[PDB]
Every structure is written in structure tokens, then in C-alpha cells.
Amino acid sequence: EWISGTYRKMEEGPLPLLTFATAPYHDQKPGTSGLRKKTYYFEEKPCYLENFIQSIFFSIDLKDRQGSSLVVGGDGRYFNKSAIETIVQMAAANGIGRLVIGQNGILSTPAVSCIIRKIKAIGGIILTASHNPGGPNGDFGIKFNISNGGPAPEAITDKIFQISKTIEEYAVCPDLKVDLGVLGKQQFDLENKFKPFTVEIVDSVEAYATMLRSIFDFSALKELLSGPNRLKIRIDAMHGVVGPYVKKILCEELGAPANSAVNCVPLEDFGGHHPDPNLTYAADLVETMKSGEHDFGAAFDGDGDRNMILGKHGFFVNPSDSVAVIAANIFSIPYFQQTGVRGFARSMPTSGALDRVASATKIALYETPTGWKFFGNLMDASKLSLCGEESFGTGSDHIREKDGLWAVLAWLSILATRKQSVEDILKDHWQKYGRNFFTRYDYEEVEAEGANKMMKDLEALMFDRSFVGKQFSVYTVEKADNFEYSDPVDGSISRNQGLRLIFTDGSRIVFRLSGATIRLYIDSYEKDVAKINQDPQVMLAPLISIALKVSQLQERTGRTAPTVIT
Numbered sequence: 001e002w003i004s005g006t007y008r009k010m011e012e013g014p015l016p017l018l019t020f021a022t023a024p025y026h027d028q029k030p031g032t033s034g035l036r037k038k039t040y041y042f043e044e045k046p047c048y049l050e051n052f053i054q055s056i057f058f059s060i061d062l063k064d065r066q067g068s069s070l071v072v073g074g075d076g077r078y079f080n081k082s083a084i085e086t087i088v089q090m091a092a093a094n095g096i097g098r099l100v101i102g103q104n105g106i107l108s109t110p111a112v113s114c115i116i117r118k119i120k121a122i123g124g125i126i127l128t129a130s131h132n133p134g135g136p137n138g139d140f141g142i143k144f145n146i147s148n149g150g151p152a153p154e155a156i157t158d159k160i161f162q163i164s165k166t167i168e169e170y171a172v173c174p175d176l177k178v179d180l181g182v183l184g185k186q187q188f189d190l191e192n193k194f195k196p197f198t199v200e201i202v203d204s205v206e207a208y209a210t211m212l213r214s215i216f217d218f219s220a221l222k223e224l225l226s227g228p229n230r231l232k233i234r235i236d237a238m239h240g241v242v243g244p245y246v247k248k249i250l251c252e253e254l255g256a257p258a259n260s261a262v263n264c265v266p267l268e269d270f271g272g273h274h275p276d277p278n279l280t281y282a283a284d285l286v287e288t289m290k291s292g293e294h295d296f297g298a299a300f301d302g303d304g305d306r307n308m309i310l311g312k313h314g315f316f317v318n319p320s321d322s323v324a325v326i327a328a329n330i331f332s333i334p335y336f337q338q339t340g341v342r343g344f345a346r347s348m349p350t351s352g353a354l355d356r357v358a359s360a361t362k363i364a365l366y367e368t369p370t371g372w373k374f375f376g377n378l379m380d381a382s383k384l385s386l387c388g389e390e391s392f393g394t395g396s397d398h399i400r401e402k403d404g405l406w407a408v409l410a411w412l413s414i415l416a417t418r419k420q421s422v423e424d425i426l427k428d429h430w431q432k433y434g435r436n437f438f439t440r441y442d443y444e445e446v447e448a449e450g451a452n453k454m455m456k457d458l459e460a461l462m463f464d465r466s467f468v469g470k471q472f473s474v475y476t477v478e479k480a481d482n483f484e485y486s487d488p489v490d491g492s493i494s495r496n497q498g499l500r501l502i503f504t505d506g507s508r509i510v511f512r513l514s515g516a517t518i519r520l521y522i523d524s525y526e527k528d529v530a531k532i533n534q535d536p537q538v539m540l541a542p543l544i545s546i547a548l549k550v551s552q553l554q555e556r557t558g559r560t561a562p563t564v565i566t
């Protein structure tokens with residue numbers, strides 16, 4: 001009862017804010033996707049969570065921290081609610097004015113970016129480990145986003161690591177109890193303070209759904225998905241965070257039947273499976289697609305910034321192609337009608353399918369390294385409209401994070417506009433722009449020094465001029481290098497971003513490391529319409545054999561088959 005909680009709050013009196021001593025850890029360096037460790041790091045190690053959170057607060061200036069608003073939310077994995085409560089008490093003791101938290105701690109990463117930008121927050125804390133499994137024996141992470149809605153840049157994370165390495169005390173309001181399940185405002189009387197502390201529990205879906213309603217034509221979506229002659233879709237949230245979004249948006253508001261969603265209840269362990277959308281970890285989805293009923297399938301990851309796009313009977317549209325089709329039919333979306341195409345971008349290991357659409361029009365295309373920093377740098381400079389990564393990433397400049405459900409609704413808008421099947425659209429695209437046959441082999445969790453030695457010896461073997469011009473079977477080595485990127489907005493230089501083997505026919509073999517994990521990307525272009533409709537595994541097989549033979553991956557890793565194939 002709300003009245004009982006109010007009376008309790010009144011009788012307890014003001015809540016003291018207290019300083020507690022702590023000892024610093026040494027591995028709290030937040031990388032590209034924040035700080036991710038095993039769950040027991042945050043659940044069992046003393047003050048680990050408090051140390052990192054307090055470091056995040058200290059990385060914010062005091063004038064930026066006093067009275068400001070901070071968004072807090074996560075993907076609903078195990079231990080998220082407890083950590084969120086700790087964040088609420090610490091934030092109460094650290095001068096934060098207001099915390100906007102999604103109901104029950106549920107808030108997808110794109111929803112966090114959107115809310116941050118909407119309410120003019122100083123930033124947000126996202127409790128997610130992305131596609132990594134959850135549970136007491138799973139993983140756990142913390143991302144910090146700044147006032148532009150995007151991930152904190154390297155300077156902020158550097159300050160967080162440096163602060164966390166020497167921190168000796170933190171502040172907390174240990175008697176603050178907050179109910180995450182009831183929407184509305186909860187205020188707390190703080191001791192020795194005159195303003196109360198505010199916690200606003202908002203609907204996890206409302207603001208994000210309003211944003212998408214502004215992005216797309218929900219009338220066309222409604223006519224496409226809700227009719228008796230509806231387009232049969234099957235959306236697999238993988239027990240992740242997009243489930244509630246899938247129902248409130250696709251099912252309720254747009255009229256798709258409730259049978260269209262599956263694995264759409266957020267589970268604290270993601271139902272035992274890895275919340276990673278690909279052909280391996282989402283095999284159940286692709287095998288129900290193999291049956292016959294549905295024309296469109298899609299899968300999401302843990303925090304909702306990734307998507308897998310499937311056609312009828314299991315037809316697979318690889319992400320490198322997905323972003324290119326979206327770019328080729330980009331004006332089927334009202335948002336880009338209002339916006340215009342400011343630029344295209346893709347990560348280097350992503351196939352050059354988008355490049356063909358960029359060159360067909362006259363739109364600048366930026367080949368960035370793996371990561372968000374470069375995409376956000378281009379977006380803030382009004383030079384990037386649509387971007388995509390082979391790691392099942394697709395997004396626009398509407399927010400400062402990638403967005404899986406947004407990409408799905410974009411594919412539904414393109415299907416509604418073109419009135420064709422997914423496979424037919426992909427075939428027409430291949431016949432218009434040529435096909436970029438693409439594959440990626442994931443060799444997960446190998447011995448570290450063996451992989452590093454493979455990359456060093458392979459690198460030295462590549463840099464020799466005895467390598468350039470050698471004919472492999474037939475292909476001819478044109479260039480081999482270690483990818484370097486010069487950022488066109490802040491002059492930053494990123495080196496060692498992937499070993500590249502570019503051939504004279506435009507094909508590429510790329511090696512990268514994510515410990516550790518070996519990632520092998522193969523991209524070969526075909527312009528003849530007679531050859532663009534063959535099994536890519538069969539078309540790329542010579543280049544795969546060249547990659548394994550030149551790298552000697554088997555003889556140094558002992559692996560005879562990749563863990564995942566894309």
C-alpha cells in the first residue's frame with residue numbers, strides 16, 4: 001500500500017548519509033561496453049559495486065552532479081535489482097537530484113539513450129552484459145552513458161579507472177528503501193539536507209515507443225501486421241529486455257497477434273541460453289522459420305541493440321546485407337525523409353554491401369574500426385545517418401546507441417512499402433548492386449599466447465614484400481596491412497584494428513581478436529548476375545582455405561571447426 005509506505009517514511013524520519021571506508025580493486029577498467037565481469041565479482045566481492053559506482057560519480061564534476069538527473073536501468077539479468085538499489089542509495093548520498101528508473105529495473109539500452117536525451121539527464125547507468133549469459137553463474141556489467149545518450153568516451157572511462165584504482169571511501173544512504181515495481185514519484189527525506197531526493201519509476205516502454213512512433217508510419221505498420229491477411233511474423237526476444245517492447249509495440253499498439261512473440265518474458269538467466277542473436281545461439285527460431293507459416297523473423301540480444309533478420313523458410317539476411325538493404329530503401333522510413341541521408345558507415349570487418357549503395361548514390365561512407373566511438377563521433381558531426389556492424393548491429397542517428405527493434409520496424413516498413421518477400425528483396429538488391437558474399441568464423445575462447453603468436457607471425461608474414469603479388473589458389477595478394485583509422489572529427493588515430501588481406505579482385509580476409517577469441521571475416525564481391533545465387537559457404541570456400549592455410553590457425557590453436565559460423 002502506498003499509504004503504508006508514506007506513513008513509514010514519515011515515522012522513520014530523515015535518512016542519514018554516511019561515509020564508509022573501502023579498499024580499491026585493480027581490474028575495474030571499463031572497456032568499450034562498460035565494465036563486464038562474472039556475476040560473483042559484483043555479488044560477492046566486498047564493495048566492488050560500490051567502488052565502481054562511486055568512481056562513476058566522481059568522474060562527473062560536482063556542479064554537474066548536484067541536483068542533476070540520472071537514468072538507471074538494465075536488461076533484467078540476475079542481481080540487477082540489488083545493484084540498482086545500491087545505486088539508488090549511493091546516488092541519494094552523492095547529491096544526485098533525481099533518478100529515472102524503468103519499472104522493475106527494466107530498460108533497454110536504446111531506451112536508456114532515448115530517455116537520457118529526452119529528459120536532459122547528465123547520463124545513465126545501464127546494468128547489462130549485452131549478449132552474455134546471465135544468472136548467478138553468468139556475467140554482469142555496468143555501462144555509463146553521458147548527456148548525449150551515448151557511451152562514455154575514453155577520457156571518462158579512463159578517469160573512472162584511475163579513480164577506482166585508488167578509492168578509499170564512498171557515500172551511501174543505507175536506510176533508503178525504494179520500490180521498483182510501482183510507477184510514479186517516490187521522495188526521500190535526507191538528513192542534513194533541505195531538498196528531498198526523488199526517484200521516478202517510469203514505464204519501461206512508453207518513451208521509447210513514442211520515439212519509434214515518431215520515427216515510423218504506425219498506420220502502415222498497423223495495416224501490414226494486424227489485418228486478417230497479415231504478414232506473419234515471429235519475433236524472438238531470447239528472454240531478453242525487448243520482450244515488453246515487443247508486446248506493447250508490435251502486439252498491442254500495432255495489432256500483431258500474441259503468437260507472433262516468443263521468449264518475450266525477461267528472465268534473470270535468459271532461460272539458460274545465451275541471449276545472442278545468430279544462427280547458432282538462436283537456432284530454435286531459424287528452425288521454426290524452416291517450417292512455413294511466417295514470412296519474417298527476428299531475434300534480439302540481452303540489452304536490445306542487436307538484431308537478426310530472417311526470411312521465409314529460414315532465409316538468412318546477414319547484417320552486412322541488412323544495413324545495405326535498409327540504406328537502399330532508406331526513404332521508406334519517414335525519419336530519413338525528415339532528416340536526409342547525412343552519411344553511411346560500417347565497421348571494417350563488415351562487408352562492403354553498404355559501400356555499393358553509398359556509391360550508387362553520392363553519400364560519404366566511413367569505414368571505421370570495431371566499436372561505437374567512431375560512429376558516435378560521425379553522428380554528432382551531422383555526417384552519419386545509418387550505420388551497421390557485422391556483429392548484428394544496425395542503427396541510425398536518432399539516438400546514440402544501436403537499436404534492434406528499430407531495425408526490425410525499419411525492415412517491416414521496407415516490406416510494407418515494397419510489397420515483396422524478404423528473399424525477393426534481397427535477390428533484387430543483389431541483382432542491382434552485386435552481391436557481397438560474406439562470412440565470419442568465431443573461434444571462441446582459445447589459448448591466449450597461441451592466438452597472439454598467430455597474429456604476430458601472421459602479421460610479419462603479411463608485411464613482407466615476398467607476400468604482395470603472390471598468387472593463391474585463383475587470387476592475387478594486392479595489399480596486406482594492420483588496419484589504421486584516422487578520425488575525421490577529433491584527429492584520433494586507432495592502430496592495430498585488424499589484419500587485412502586485400503586481393504586484386506577486391507576480396508578481403510580479415511583477422512581480429514576480441515580470452516581470447518579469434519574472429520575471421522571473409523568478404524568477396526560478385527557482379528555477374530549468374531554467380532550471385534550460389535551457396536556463400538561454397539563460393540567463399542577457396543578464400544576460407546586460404547585464410548586457414550596462411551594463418552596456420554589449426555596447427556596453433558588445435559581447433560578444427562569454428563565455434564560459430566555467420
Ligand SMILES: O=P(O)(O)OC[C@H]1O[C@H](O)[C@H](O)[C@@H](O)[C@@H]1O
Pocket residue numbers: 032033130347370371372389391393512513514519
Ligand atoms: O569483436 P569484438 O572486439 O568482441 O567487438 C564486437 C562488438 O562488441 C560490441 O558489441 C560493440 O558494440 C560492437 O561495435 C562490436 O562489433
Ligand SMILES: [Zn+2]
Pocket residue numbers: 130131301302303304305306
Ligand atoms: Zn547488446
